[PDB]
RNA sequence: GAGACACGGUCCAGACUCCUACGGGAGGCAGCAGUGGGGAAUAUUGCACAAUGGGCGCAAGCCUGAUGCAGCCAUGCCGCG
RNA sequence: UACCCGCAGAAGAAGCACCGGCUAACUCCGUGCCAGCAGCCGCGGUAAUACGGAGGGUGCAAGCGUUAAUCGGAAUUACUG
């Protein structure tokens, strides 16, 4: 469940800090985004010496979010918060080069195999 | 056939520049005469003094241009007391030659030109809230537009949005010539003197 | 004057500048060879005079002077400056080092060489 | 333990660099050499503990890379060419 | 190993700066307010000891010019003064 004007946290160390949705992609009138599926973004407030700076659009992959995912056996993990990593809006990899948190193994595909590497702890 | 835009510049000296400017004006020509190619003169706005000219543009019509021309572009000096005062001792006077720059002028397509109908903006009266005579002439590639709704007949709205958009168009096209002369007059002062490509010695004027 | 006066408040000391404050404590500070060009001196000398234009790793900009018969600098370029004032060049501070990360000596002098750098011509 | 709240001792947190089955672990040259970088600019991954004496022990022994010192350099200075 | 004793040969080692005045030391040939510029005063625009080469002198030398840089000369923060 995300949506445009969501706010979101970052998980990566790329130098923003939050982000807001603006686009919801793969679709006509699409309304929501779960883990797994790429988004829109703009930076709203980041540190002083990063890679990105503030006010930039730019391309966002979901992490993790507060509604959860569903499992074969009807099982569901939910969390805290929506967590974002960034990727690059031509190429779609990683920008930064270490995440924080947990992930999931929706991620588990040949474009993410990166983030579930460097990704500390995997539920 | 290339065409070349050249101008020749006292720089910021004196009547023995000008007259320098004059004569090497003329050795040029003729010069390109013997060449064999033909020009036209654009501007010869004169001195101060008798047989002394300020600066000249030339229009250069012809073939192999750019190799008669890397021997006249820089510095011509000529070595020589003044005429205008009999004791001065300074005896180089620098001139300057330099290319210029021309642009793409092209008569106005009417292809070019979108319209759009529209509600005349008023107050208003009921009919106006009806009539789409507001004729909007919109230029694509520049994006300028122009509305005409002075008249009640929408064949005349069109006509006087066309004839708008020509006069608008014709102060973008003029406000670009006065730009590059803003370019052509950086010359005058960005006369080097030193370094001179050519020397001329004396009255008899000998090339070096 | 009087040594109660001296006493309250003593003998002030004068301070004095560098005039060559670019150095920075050190003699070269790095640059780079941004512009080159001929300027001419003012009353009451007149020639052509070869200087160039240089970056400070600090965020400010010089300007050197090249000595010397002819020189083979162009733009895109790092050299040193070693010190020395030309006035009558209003604004130039600094001597170029006649092969100094960028530059060569002069060519075919004689005599004089440690000055401008040429090499021993050796029979 | 006498001793600071601690270089090569301990615990915690932090950034950085590594090994992993992913559960978890390891490290600190401002010691002597050395590498990359920065600079306008400064030496060789040398040896004997034979000596010093810190040190630790009754001592041998050894840290010893401080010391004795090397190899190198026009660096300051001195005396030599 | 410092050092002490034999071999051969001037060999295997003489160069660098400034130069009108301050300051020890200026003639010529090329060029012509061009090429060339310092510490200051200032040279070069047809006669240059101030530019280049030749040359010459002078003085130094494992170093000269430039700063980072100091003190002095500066009685120019002066108690001595
Ligand atoms: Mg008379
Ligand atoms: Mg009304
Ligand atoms: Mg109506
Ligand atoms: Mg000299
Ligand atoms: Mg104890
Ligand atoms: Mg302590
Ligand atoms: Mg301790
Ligand atoms: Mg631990
Ligand atoms: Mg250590
Ligand atoms: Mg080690
Ligand atoms: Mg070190
Ligand atoms: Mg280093
Ligand atoms: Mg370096
Ligand atoms: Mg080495
Ligand atoms: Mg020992
Ligand atoms: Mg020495
Ligand atoms: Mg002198
Ligand atoms: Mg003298
Ligand atoms: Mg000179
Ligand atoms: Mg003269
Ligand atoms: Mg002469
Ligand atoms: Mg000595
Ligand atoms: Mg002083
Ligand atoms: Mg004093």
């Given at each position: ?123 | ?208 | ?16 500048k560098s005039?060559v404050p670019a150095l920075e404590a050190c003699p070269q500070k790095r640059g ?22 240089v970056?400070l790793t600090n965020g400010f900009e010089v ?17 040193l400056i070693?010190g ?9 501070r600094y ?29």
């Amino acid at each position: 469940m995300i949506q445009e004007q969501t706010m979101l946290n970052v998980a990566d160390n790329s130098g923003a800090r939050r982000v807001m949705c603006i686009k919801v992609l793969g679709g006509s009138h699409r309304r929501y985004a779960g883990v797994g599926d790429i988004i829109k973004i703009t930076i709203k407030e980041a540190i002083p010496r990063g890679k990105v700076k503030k006010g930039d659009v730019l391309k966002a992959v979901v992490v993790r979010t507060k509604k959860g995912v569903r499992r074969p056996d009807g099982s569901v993990i939910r969390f805290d918060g929506n967590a974002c990593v960034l990727l690059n809006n031509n190429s779609e990899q990683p920008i930064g080069t270490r995440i924080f948190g947990p992930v999931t193994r929706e991620l588990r595909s040949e474009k993410f195999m990166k983030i579930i590497s460097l990704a500390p702890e995997v539920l | 056939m290339e065409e070349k835009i050249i101008q020749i510049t006292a720089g910021r000296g004196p009547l023995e520049c000008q007259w320098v400017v004059a004569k090497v004006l003329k050795t040029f020509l003729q010069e390109a005469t013997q060449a064999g190619i033909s020009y036209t003169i654009l501007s010869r706005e004169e001195g101060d003094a008798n047989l002394t000219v300020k600066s000249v543009t030339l229009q250069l019509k012809g073939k192999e241009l750019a190799s008669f021309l890397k021997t006249w572009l820089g510095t011509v000096c000529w070595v020589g007391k003044s005429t205008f005062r009999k004791f001065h001792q300074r005896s180089n006077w620098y001139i300057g030659v330099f290319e210029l720059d021309q642009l793409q002028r092209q008569l106005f397509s009417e292809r070019d030109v979108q319209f759009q109908t529209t509600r005349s903006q008023g107050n208003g009266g009921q009919n106006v809230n009806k009539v789409n005579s507001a004729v909007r002439a919109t230029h694509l590639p520049t994006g300028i537009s122009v509305l005409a709704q002075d008249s009640r007949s929408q064949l005349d709205n069109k006509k006087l949005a066309l004839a708008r958009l020509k006069e608008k168009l014709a102060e973008m096209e003029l406000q670009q010539l006065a730009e590059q002369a803003q370019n052509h007059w950086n010359n005058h002062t960005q006369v080097q003197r030193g370094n001179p490509v050519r020397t001329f010695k004396g009255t008899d004027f000998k090339s070096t | 004057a009087t040594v109660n006066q001296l006493v309250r408040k003593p003998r002030a000391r004068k301070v004095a500048k560098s005039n060559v404050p670019a150095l920075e404590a050190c003699p070269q500070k790095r640059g780079v060879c941004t512009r080159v060009y001929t300027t001419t001196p003012k009353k009451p000398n007149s020639a052509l005079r070869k200087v160039c234009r240089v970056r400070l790793t600090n965020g400010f900009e010089v300007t050197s002077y090249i000595g010397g018969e002819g020189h083979n600098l162009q733009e895109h370029s790092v050299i040193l400056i070693r010190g020395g004032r030309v006035k009558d060049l209003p604004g130039v501070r600094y001597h170029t080092v006649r092969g100094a990360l960028d530059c060569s000596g002069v060519k075919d002098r004689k005599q004089a060489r440690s000055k401008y750098g040429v090499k021993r011509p050796k029979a």
